[PDB]
Amino acid sequence: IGMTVEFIPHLFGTNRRPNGSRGWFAYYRMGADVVNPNAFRLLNVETA
């Protein structure tokens, strides 16, 4: 899912009572990896 913004109308305090504030939530999901390692070439410089 792409970026999604959710509005939280009420927050709560330590004693589980409202404290007069609101909220804005946003979440993102993604995954990625490499299938064929041999089909890539990467240059590495090893400096002592």
């Binding site: 305090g13 330590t14 004693n15 009572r17 409202p18 404290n19 007069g20 504030s21």
Partner: protein, 49 residues
């Protein structure tokens, strides 16, 4: 039922509200009876107008 008003308070920003809980009473009113009886004779009922 009878109750009282919620006690508001002056709170700053990001301050948790107080535990404002009202209480409800219960008035009790039973109903009771009044009565009165008078006897009359047949002769009196026939004669008296």
């Amino acid at each position: 039922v009878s109750s009282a008003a919620v006690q508001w308070s002056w709170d700053a920003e990001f301050e948790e509200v107080s535990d404002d809980s009202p209480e409800f009473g219960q008035p009790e009113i039973p109903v009771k009876k009044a009565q009165g009886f008078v006897p009359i004779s047949i002769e009196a009922l026939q004669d008296e107008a």
